[PDB]
Amino acid sequence: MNIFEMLRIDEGLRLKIYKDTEGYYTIGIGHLLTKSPSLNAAKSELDKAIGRNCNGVITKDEAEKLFNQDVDAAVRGILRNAKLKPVYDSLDAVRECALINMVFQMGETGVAGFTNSLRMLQQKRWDEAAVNLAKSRWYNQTPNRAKRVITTFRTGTWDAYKNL
Ligand SMILES: [Cl-]
Ligand SMILES: [Cl-]
Ligand SMILES: [K+]
């Protein structure tokens, strides 16, 4: 298991524009197009991202390419973030994926708001961090995914993603 497989499981894959759990236009593997409620806006954003007239639909290759770029950006974002980098550096390779997962989902800013949780992870207080992470809108809005990620932080293993 690796970050790609992990995110592919949590985001799924759709080749046509769809609305994500918050109602935002998305495509591919969780690639957010826009927060605007205009399908047209979303359609423009798509073409611009892909570089051709897609008319709302893309290929699997295209989805995967968007996917590589998005993981890359999440990582680069974590590294450029003064609150995130220290944490990520302190973490083992499995747990780092859990952090990348959150940033992919919520963005650099959102995660950086989990201040108390971030400190607990840095101190390696796994159970305490897991409880803290659960006291969030994120857990309440997407509990199954949040469970998987928190379990990953808690255990250092891929158990939560095995048998999926
Ligand atoms: Cl893009
Ligand atoms: Cl969920
Ligand atoms: K590390």
From Swiss-Prot:
EC numbers: 3.2.1.17
Subcellular localization(s) per the UniProt record: Host cytoplasm
Entries under InterPro entries matching the protein: Endolysin_T4_type (IPR034690), Glyco_hydro_24 (IPR002196), Lysozyme-like_dom_sf (IPR023346), Lysozyme_dom_sf (IPR023347), Phage_lysozyme-like (IPR052619), T4-type_lysozyme (IPR001165)
Record-listed substrate binding positions: L32, F104, S117, N132
Catalytic reactions of this protein: Hydrolysis of (1->4)-beta-linkages between N-acetylmuramic acid and N-acetyl-D-glucosamine residues in a peptidoglycan and between N-acetyl-D-glucosamine residues in chitodextrins
Phenotype upon changing G30F: Almost complete loss of enzymatic activity. The enzyme is destabilized by 1.5 kcal/mol
Active-site residues annotated for this sequence: E11 (proton donor/acceptor), D20 (proton donor/acceptor)
Reported impact of T26H: Facilitates transglycosylation more effectively than hydrolysis; covalently bound substrate
The protein's role, per its UniProt record: Endolysin with lysozyme activity that degrades host peptidoglycans and participates with the holin and spanin proteins in the sequential events which lead to the programmed host cell lysis releasing the mature viral particles. Once the holin has permeabilized the host cell membrane, the endolysin can reach the periplasm and break down the peptidoglycan layer.
Protein name as catalogued: Endolysin
Organism lineage string: Viruses, Duplodnaviria, Heunggongvirae, Uroviricota, Caudoviricetes
